[PDB]
């Protein structure tokens, strides 16, 4: 398959900024008929993808002139001369010269905000869940920027990876921060074999991880 | 005005055959140069198959053994079959048009959501998340083990909307789980009641869970 590599995969911008997205193909997108079938699509939340550019650099009717495409062979670029808020979303390059027709992974055009430390909260299993026979330990990591963050669970001071599932909100519409949940699901039997439960968050806003714990018995 | 519209079964069990239909208006597949393709977005975008006015057919080679595309130009419809579905076929499926004189996906359908799962309809268990002993107070509700999507969560019947984060659902053993957090002043809780309201229409569930200290 022709691999379409987009750089970067996340692009934080301020409104009004110029923005550029690279798409490099693993083989030339030139077709035997001489055309280069490289297209760019924008997908907004709750919408089907919409066509922006076709054959490298031809803007589709109705697409604002702040969008342009360029390149040739294996090297392509989408440029936005000034980013408007309505432009935020996921941009895909796409080649239709070779079978299978292939998309890039998507580049999320997102807002820059001020760096912000996460607020971390840990919760033990509720008495209702414990009576019911299960044990979920929940950690919220809320309102941080940038979106890059590491979460580590420890049980009795030892790293635990099995049974952890994470989920993320989209960028906040008020302050441009991100939030995430991390949930450790144990059997009640497992839960009742261990005492200390810890959620640790590492984020660029501090050298030291944010550590929140509880003890099962307290 | 050109439109395309996908239809499918909504939910299927693993091993069943998926039958998708694309119905369209404002153009005809009989028109020289017309084509229609299928693209899906699994839980980025992946092109599946494509068919032309003259019945020429193209497939993603990695998926060919499971795919069959066909047309009925009179009915003005295109069909896609995917045999032996499994959980990875859970996705939104789009159909989209191209023409030799407008050779790009200008027109897409709205998409049809497909979930492939062996789960049965299951109501959520709703659990309170109250802080232990170890300024602003963050509370939450854990909505665990439901099927199918969706659930909705509000706080105090929607009167409490500021400082709320409701996370997307994830799958654990074929059942969905999500949590919602709400952050309020320490002067608010527990002086005032804070209750999460969870609805899961597939199981007729409307449940309120008051958050109380542990």
């Amino acid at each position: 398959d022709v691999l379409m590599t987009q750089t970067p995969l996340s692009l934080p911008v301020s409104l009004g900024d110029q923005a550029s997205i690279s798409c490099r193909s693993s083989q030339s997108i030139v077709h035997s008929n001489g055309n280069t079938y490289l297209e760019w699509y924008l997908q907004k939340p709750g919408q089907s993808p919409k066509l922006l550019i076709y054959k490298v650099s031809n803007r589709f009717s109705g697409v604002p002139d702040r969008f342009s495409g360029s390149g040739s062979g294996t090297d392509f670029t989408l440029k936005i001369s000034r980013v408007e808020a309505e432009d935020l979303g996921i941009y895909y390059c796409f080649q239709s010269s070779h079978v299978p027709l292939t998309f890039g992974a998507g580049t999320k055009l997102e807002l820059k905000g001020a760096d912000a430390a996460p607020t971390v909260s840990i919760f033990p299993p509720s008495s209702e869940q414990l009576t019911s026979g299960g044990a979920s330990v929940v950690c919220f990591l809320n309102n941080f920027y940038p979106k890059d963050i590491n979460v580590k669970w420890k049980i009795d001071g030892s790293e635990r990876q099995n049974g952890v599932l994470n989920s993320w909100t989209d960028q906040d519409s008020k302050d441009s921060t991100y939030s995430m949940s991390s949930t450790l699901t144990l059997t009640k039997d497992e839960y009742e074999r261990h005492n200390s439960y810890t959620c640790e968050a590492t984020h660029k806003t501090s050298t030291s991880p944010i550590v929140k714990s509880f003890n099962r018995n307290e | 005005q050109v439109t395309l519209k996908e239809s499918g079964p909504g939910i299927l069990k693993p091993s069943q055959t998926l039958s998708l239909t694309c119905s369209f208006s404002g153009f005809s597949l009989s028109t020289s140069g017309m084509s229609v393709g299928w693209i899906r977005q699994p839980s980025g975008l992946e092109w599946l198959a494509h068919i032309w006015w003259d019945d020429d057919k193209y497939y993603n080679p990695s998926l060919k053994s499971r795919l069959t595309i066909s047309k009925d130009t009179s009915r003005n419809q295109v069909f896609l079959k995917i045999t032996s579905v499994d959980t990875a076929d859970t996705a939104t499926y789009y159909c989209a048009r191209r023409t030799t004189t407008a050779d790009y996906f200008a027109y897409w359908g709205q998409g049809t959501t497909l979930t492939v799962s062996s789960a049965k309809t299951t109501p959520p268990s709703v659990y309170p998340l109250a802080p232990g002993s170890a300024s602003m107070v963050t509370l939450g509700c854990l909505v665990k083990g439901y099927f199918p999507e969706p659930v909705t969560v509000t706080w105090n019947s929607g009167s409490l909307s500021s400082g709320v984060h409701t996370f997307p659902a994830v799958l654990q053993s074929d059942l969905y789980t999500l949590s919602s957090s709400v952050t309020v002043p320490s002067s608010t809780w527990p002086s005032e009641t804070v209750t999460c309201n969870v609805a899961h229409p597939a199981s007729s569930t409307k449940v309120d869970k008051k958050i109380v200290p542990r």
């Binding site: 010269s97 070779h98 079978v99 | 032309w52 020429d56 080679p61 030799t100």
Partner: peptide
């Protein structure tokens, strides 16, 4: 090296 159709 299968090409997609464009004519």
């Amino acid at each position: 090296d299968a090409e997609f159709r464009h004519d």
